[PDB]
Amino acid sequence: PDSLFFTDGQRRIDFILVYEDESKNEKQKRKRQAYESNLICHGLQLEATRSVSDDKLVFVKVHAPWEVLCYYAEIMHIKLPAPFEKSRMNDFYILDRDSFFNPATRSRIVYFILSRVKYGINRLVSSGIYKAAFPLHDCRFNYESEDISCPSERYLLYREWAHPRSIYKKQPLDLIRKYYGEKIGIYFAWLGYYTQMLLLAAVVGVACFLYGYLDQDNCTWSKEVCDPDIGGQILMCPQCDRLCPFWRLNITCESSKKLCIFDSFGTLIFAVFMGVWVTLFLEFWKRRQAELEYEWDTVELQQEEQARPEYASAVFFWILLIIASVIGIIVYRLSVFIVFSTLTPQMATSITASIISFIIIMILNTIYEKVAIMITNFELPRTQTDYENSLTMKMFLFQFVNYYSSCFYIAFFKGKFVGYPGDPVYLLGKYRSEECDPGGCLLELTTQLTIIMGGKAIWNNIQEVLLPWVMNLIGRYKKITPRWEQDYHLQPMGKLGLFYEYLEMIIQFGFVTLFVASFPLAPLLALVNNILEIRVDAWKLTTQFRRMVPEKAQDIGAWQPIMQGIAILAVVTNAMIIAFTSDMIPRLVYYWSFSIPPYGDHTYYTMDGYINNTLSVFNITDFKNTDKENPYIGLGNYTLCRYRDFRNPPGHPQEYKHNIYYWHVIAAKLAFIIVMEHIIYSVKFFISYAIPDVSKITKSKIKRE
Amino acid sequence: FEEFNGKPDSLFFTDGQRRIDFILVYEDESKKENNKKGTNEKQKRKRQAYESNLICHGLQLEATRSVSDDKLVFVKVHAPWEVLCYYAEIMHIKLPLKFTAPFEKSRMNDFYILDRDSFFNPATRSRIVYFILSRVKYQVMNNVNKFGINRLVSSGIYKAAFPLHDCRFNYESEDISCPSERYLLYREWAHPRSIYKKQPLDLIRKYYGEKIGIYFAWLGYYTQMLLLAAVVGVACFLYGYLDQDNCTWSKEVCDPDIGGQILMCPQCDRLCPFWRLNITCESSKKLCIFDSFGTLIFAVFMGVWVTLFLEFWKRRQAELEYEWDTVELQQEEQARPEYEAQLCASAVFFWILLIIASVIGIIVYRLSVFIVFSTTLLTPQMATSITASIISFIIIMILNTIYEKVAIMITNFELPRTQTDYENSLTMKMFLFQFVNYYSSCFYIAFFKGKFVGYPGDPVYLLGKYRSEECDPGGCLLELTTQLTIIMGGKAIWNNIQEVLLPWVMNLIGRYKRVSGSEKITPRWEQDYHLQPMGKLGLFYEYLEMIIQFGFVTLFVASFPLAPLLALVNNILEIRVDAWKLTTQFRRMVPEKAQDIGAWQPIMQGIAILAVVTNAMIIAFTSDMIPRLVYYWSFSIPPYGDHTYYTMDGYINNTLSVFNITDFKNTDKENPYIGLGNYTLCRYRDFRNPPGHPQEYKHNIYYWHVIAAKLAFIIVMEHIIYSVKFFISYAIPDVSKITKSKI
Ligand SMILES: *[C@@H]1O[C@H](CO)[C@@H](O)[C@H](O)[C@H]1NC(C)=O
Ligand SMILES: *[C@H]1O[C@H](CO)[C@@H](O)[C@H](O)[C@H]1NC(C)=O
Ligand SMILES: [Ca+2]
Numbered sequence A: 001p002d003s004l005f006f007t008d009g010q011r012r013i014d015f016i017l018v019y020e021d022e023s024k025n026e027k028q029k030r031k032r033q034a035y036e037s038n039l040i041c042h043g044l045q046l047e048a049t050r051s052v053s054d055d056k057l058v059f060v061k062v063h064a065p066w067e068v069l070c071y072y073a074e075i076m077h078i079k080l081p082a083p084f085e086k087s088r089m090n091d092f093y094i095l096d097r098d099s100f101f102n103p104a105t106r107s108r109i110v111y112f113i114l115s116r117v118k119y120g121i122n123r124l125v126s127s128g129i130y131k132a133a134f135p136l137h138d139c140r141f142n143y144e145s146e147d148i149s150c151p152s153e154r155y156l157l158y159r160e161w162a163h164p165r166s167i168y169k170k171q172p173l174d175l176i177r178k179y180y181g182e183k184i185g186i187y188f189a190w191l192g193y194y195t196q197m198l199l200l201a202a203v204v205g206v207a208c209f210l211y212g213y214l215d216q217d218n219c220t221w222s223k224e225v226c227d228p229d230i231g232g233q234i235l236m237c238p239q240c241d242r243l244c245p246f247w248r249l250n251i252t253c254e255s256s257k258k259l260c261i262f263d264s265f266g267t268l269i270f271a272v273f274m275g276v277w278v279t280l281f282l283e284f285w286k287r288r289q290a291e292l293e294y295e296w297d298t299v300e301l302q303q304e305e306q307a308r309p310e311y312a313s314a315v316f317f318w319i320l321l322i323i324a325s326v327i328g329i330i331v332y333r334l335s336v337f338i339v340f341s342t343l344t345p346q347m348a349t350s351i352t353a354s355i356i357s358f359i360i361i362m363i364l365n366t367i368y369e370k371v372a373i374m375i376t377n378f379e380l381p382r383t384q385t386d387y388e389n390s391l392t393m394k395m396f397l398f399q400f401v402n403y404y405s406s407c408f409y410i411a412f413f414k415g416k417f418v419g420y421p422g423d424p425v426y427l428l429g430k431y432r433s434e435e436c437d438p439g440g441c442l443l444e445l446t447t448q449l450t451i452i453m454g455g456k457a458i459w460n461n462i463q464e465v466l467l468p469w470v471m472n473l474i475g476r477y478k479k480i481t482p483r484w485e486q487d488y489h490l491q492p493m494g495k496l497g498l499f500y501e502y503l504e505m506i507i508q509f510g511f512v513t514l515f516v517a518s519f520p521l522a523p524l525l526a527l528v529n530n531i532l533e534i535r536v537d538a539w540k541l542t543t544q545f546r547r548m549v550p551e552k553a554q555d556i557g558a559w560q561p562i563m564q565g566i567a568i569l570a571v572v573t574n575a576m577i578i579a580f581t582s583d584m585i586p587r588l589v590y591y592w593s594f595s596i597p598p599y600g601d602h603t604y605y606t607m608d609g610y611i612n613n614t615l616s617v618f619n620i621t622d623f624k625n626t627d628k629e630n631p632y633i634g635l636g637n638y639t640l641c642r643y644r645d646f647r648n649p650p651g652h653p654q655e656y657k658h659n660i661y662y663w664h665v666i667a668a669k670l671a672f673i674i675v676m677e678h679i680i681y682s683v684k685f686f687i688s689y690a691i692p693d694v695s696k697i698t699k700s701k702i703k704r705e
Numbered sequence B: 001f002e003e004f005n006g007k008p009d010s011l012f013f014t015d016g017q018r019r020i021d022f023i024l025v026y027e028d029e030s031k032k033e034n035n036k037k038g039t040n041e042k043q044k045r046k047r048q049a050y051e052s053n054l055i056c057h058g059l060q061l062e063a064t065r066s067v068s069d070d071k072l073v074f075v076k077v078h079a080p081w082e083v084l085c086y087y088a089e090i091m092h093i094k095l096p097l098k099f100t101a102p103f104e105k106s107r108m109n110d111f112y113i114l115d116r117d118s119f120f121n122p123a124t125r126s127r128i129v130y131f132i133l134s135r136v137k138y139q140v141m142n143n144v145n146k147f148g149i150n151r152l153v154s155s156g157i158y159k160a161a162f163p164l165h166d167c168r169f170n171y172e173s174e175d176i177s178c179p180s181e182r183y184l185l186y187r188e189w190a191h192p193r194s195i196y197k198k199q200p201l202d203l204i205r206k207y208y209g210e211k212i213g214i215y216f217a218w219l220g221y222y223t224q225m226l227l228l229a230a231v232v233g234v235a236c237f238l239y240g241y242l243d244q245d246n247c248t249w250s251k252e253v254c255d256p257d258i259g260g261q262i263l264m265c266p267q268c269d270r271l272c273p274f275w276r277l278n279i280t281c282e283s284s285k286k287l288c289i290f291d292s293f294g295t296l297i298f299a300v301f302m303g304v305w306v307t308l309f310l311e312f313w314k315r316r317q318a319e320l321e322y323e324w325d326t327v328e329l330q331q332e333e334q335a336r337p338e339y340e341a342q343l344c345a346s347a348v349f350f351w352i353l354l355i356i357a358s359v360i361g362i363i364v365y366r367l368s369v370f371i372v373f374s375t376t377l378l379t380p381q382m383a384t385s386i387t388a389s390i391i392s393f394i395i396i397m398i399l400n401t402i403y404e405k406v407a408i409m410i411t412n413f414e415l416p417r418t419q420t421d422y423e424n425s426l427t428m429k430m431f432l433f434q435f436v437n438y439y440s441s442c443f444y445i446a447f448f449k450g451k452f453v454g455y456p457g458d459p460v461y462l463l464g465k466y467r468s469e470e471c472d473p474g475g476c477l478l479e480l481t482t483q484l485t486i487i488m489g490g491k492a493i494w495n496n497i498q499e500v501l502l503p504w505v506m507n508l509i510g511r512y513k514r515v516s517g518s519e520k521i522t523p524r525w526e527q528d529y530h531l532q533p534m535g536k537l538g539l540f541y542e543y544l545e546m547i548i549q550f551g552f553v554t555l556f557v558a559s560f561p562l563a564p565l566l567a568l569v570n571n572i573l574e575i576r577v578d579a580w581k582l583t584t585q586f587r588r589m590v591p592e593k594a595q596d597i598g599a600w601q602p603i604m605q606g607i608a609i610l611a612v613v614t615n616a617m618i619i620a621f622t623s624d625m626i627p628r629l630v631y632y633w634s635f636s637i638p639p640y641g642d643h644t645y646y647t648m649d650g651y652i653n654n655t656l657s658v659f660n661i662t663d664f665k666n667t668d669k670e671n672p673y674i675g676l677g678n679y680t681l682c683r684y685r686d687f688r689n690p691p692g693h694p695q696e697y698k699h700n701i702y703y704w705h706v707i708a709a710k711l712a713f714i715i716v717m718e719h720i721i722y723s724v725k726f727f728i729s730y731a732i733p734d735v736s737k738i739t740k741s742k743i
């Protein structure tokens, strides 16, 4: 039969206490017997049934007496499965005296009973008293349950919302929380809304990218870079010590033509628009959170204090973060170094460098996870919620640095403070600073960013779930045991599965919002990843894992502060990216100021001559001020070389000092930073303040009565 | 009813056991009715129905004829147990126990009950009876229900309705049982003989209720924090003052061999001649005083101080909310739509009026300066600055009332939902109008004066014949300081004089309109009726003046370190000014309870957030500290300068730019300068290349170095200050330890 009720008995089970017979250490048998006897004596039904699949395994099942269960549920602030009270027995319409209650709530009550009972379920399992304790699923996802009385909720939810055949179908949050709990419901609601407006971000980003794409023909500076008569004649200086010749600037036609895509006005407008998209996300999410909190049974009081089975050094943690960021930076730098020490060539080298760095990030991720777990266990938190909050902050900071160290270095600290070839900078000693090509390092920042985004999303989700699904797909294209035994054969989520899910989503949100200027198509990848992830998470939760006790919560958790921090950091990082990593400001300044007779020689504003009239000049006879061996020996009969910097030419009264163009450009950069940051912050404040003028609709729904 | 018994200060009924809680005053028909007698008899019927419903609800009443004017009748009121306890229960009025709860008849025996007039304070009794008066109705016409005491006074049915003071402020009550709280309040709190003692906020709350106690506690705490800021600002100004012999650039300006030789260039078209820079020695010394590093340190300290002030006020507000147990009646709240009631177009109209207000402020300041300059022909320049500021302030005060009235009209055209919405709309509109009207000239001087005027060859005319003004080599910071101190001091002085005088003269006018040689005794109600009404807005204007003062103190503290000292002196006076005017020249405002100061808190947070950016902009653009630092660190050196080590020597001569007098181009007015025919070149205040040169008069590298330094300073200071403010807000728990202990 394998029914959900007691064998030949009209009573429903709520937890399975499986123990192994001693027959194949009397202390363990005595302890288990005492614990089981006390549990039964407390007023909970008990029965032991031999496993059909294996005779050795003797499973123990329980029940829920109606009166005691209802009373102890009333012990805590629980509403109707609208407070529940026998004096109001007739007030609430009841389909049946013994099955009206939600099985999820019944399992929650039995779990609370087990938790409060004292002589440690996890402690007993560690000592062997109870091998496991879990509730039961309604029906098999493979084939429907034999008992017709079962509504078959699990398989229905599977077919409707987990299987890819419903990839485009809407998310049924109703059955989701009614079956699993508030945690899963709110998680999936947040993820769905996240995707919903990632669609808007993606469409705007695609529009901007296409606008950039259509203007390859009119990209004047790239054309000048390519014309051999102009670009080829320019002979740039070597960018390294012993392993680089004097090179023409035109060898970078492919790089410049690609970079003219991601470095146009489209990118600037897209960054400005994302500046307000982020605040729209936050504000509408607060709206939806209020809506969900009111709609659902989310008015349950919380305990003042809680116990925990287990029960300054903060500066030491900061040292760990510092060494983590430095290790990431060094990992990327050595990766690029080793791969270089050996269209297609340079781009492939950069791609392989990014891949190697991301691989090393993945291997180090486990190390940060373990060290964070150990250091947070060292404090021995008294309670639980504080433990999850500490884990969230510590794990998030480790992931943040481990994932953004390379990107931040490539954006801000690469080629930003290298001097002219006469007096180069060695910040650490015998460690020359790498310098970007005339276009800038924006393109290879974008490469690193996209590689990390993709690689993480794909590899993680694929390797962690899609295995059985991919073997099933390959096959497609190219004895009776009770429910408790089958559910035992499954494995549990542990205590941090939802935590890891929020970690993945928050890291993705960081990728898509922090460096959005460099890569405007990041929202598209985030959208595709989320469309995959919703169904992947639903499938794995409904299929591969034991039943989870529901929990009560109103907010996503300790992440909302992290979301706001990410947004307020993203605005400034985008401003800095556009100001410094990109070269939009220097070329605008040239267009508007240095193409006019006082400085230029054209009769109108134009981009003509930007490259030739912006590159500085260097004098080999000034090869070095230390008068040591120089890289300019040999390498042809060349006399003068040009480098990417704004400095006075040789023979000027101020020999190789920053000229007026440098200061004009830097003033323009700072003006852009301040004006854009002030505009964006002002608009964000206005949007936040306009909740009465914006989101009145759902508050009106609440207030209508 | 019956006539006056003969005890003037007796606050009881004629029997002597019933305490009076309100006096309703109306006009009898015995006067010569005019226009429509039907309206008169309709008013009679309405008032008769009102009093009938009042007596039905259980309020005892009796009337009396005014001794002098037979046409005036004063209708007393009184509330016994039944109604008093019932309405206390419905309004959840909390009574002293001893963990405190509202009052219910089910729980009479659990209270510290002594006697009716004893156990309930007269303020609470007056508030209860006022709520009863407002709830009660009298009749219905036009298929609409009509109720409320306020509508009776609005329609002229009732002249007034008010509670009564315990006794005269200057004389004790003859009734020994009387507390004579007004006497003690006048002797200790008001009457500046106690100009120094800390005010007894508990007695103020007892007498006038929390609406006044909160304002006065806010003012006291404000004054203490102003004392802190004033001491620090005096230290900074004093350090700037003790360091003048070391202010090298001013020594250069005054030196008759460096500053004197520099032949500056004419500023106006033809109304002013060439001049030598050493005529500004006094201005240079003043700028050394007001433009040192002490000003920067004080700007940073004020950035911290505003946040400390806000946080400690929040802590004080929480403590006060606990101590005055206002939480329950703050929760118990309801509002009724105004009987005056029964679009975005108005919003855009108000915004347009705001733009015009700003433009008119700028224009009036400019015209005042222009006329004072034209009239000419103990420093003459200082006298001109003071005179221009004086006329500007006079016109600003004149236009303040116009903006007051137009804001009232604009908000009335929009239909408020209720009293609170109306009051918040007034808060917003009045604050925006006053902000523009007062700070437009200051912002103009700070940011838009002598900033976009070209070299003398090609001046920047706004639209023709209107040349832009320019400052002296030091800058217009001293002009800004003079304007700001004049505006602040004049506003304070005129406001205090008006506040003290106007109710006094109006009271004397009312008294003299009754020249009858009475020389007799009059009852409490009749003599309280002659006092001023204190219109329903209340402390709105008091908060408005204090908030404008807060704006002056914080927004421009980078140019005037002594602003907190003026604020402190003004507040030390204002405490007793407001206390006296309230206790001695006004009828008892009906008490009520308030949570916080009100709609002004968002205003104060906005001012605090804007203060940082405004101060950064002032220090960067209005002042000349940044060019001085750039010259010291980057232009006193061999690549550009000649000095072996960093120094400020030669700053003035090397910074001032050069112009070739014959190089005035354009065909219009070909003889603007060459009339004098004295020399062939002039020095002007700008960073531009000299004559000749590939780029004759285009901005030179020094200009862009300075601009980059300015923008970098703005970024650094704004980010650092905001980060420090956020960390300070996070660190402060925002509630006292003891208060957390209590509950
Ligand atoms: C670059 O310029 C050189 C010099 O004229 C040249 O011969 C070459 O064809 C050009 N293009 C590339 C891709 O190198
Ligand atoms: C400044 O010096 C000049 C010449 O050295 C002199 O004529 C002038 O009188 C001095 N200043 C004043 C205010 O007199
Ligand atoms: Ca996952």
Ligand SMILES: [Ca+2]
Pocket (backbone or CB within 6 Å): B492, B495, B496, B499, B545, B574
């Ligand atoms: Ca005043």
Ligand SMILES: [Ca+2]
Pocket (backbone or CB within 6 Å): B499, B542, B545, B574, B577, B578
């Ligand atoms: Ca006042």
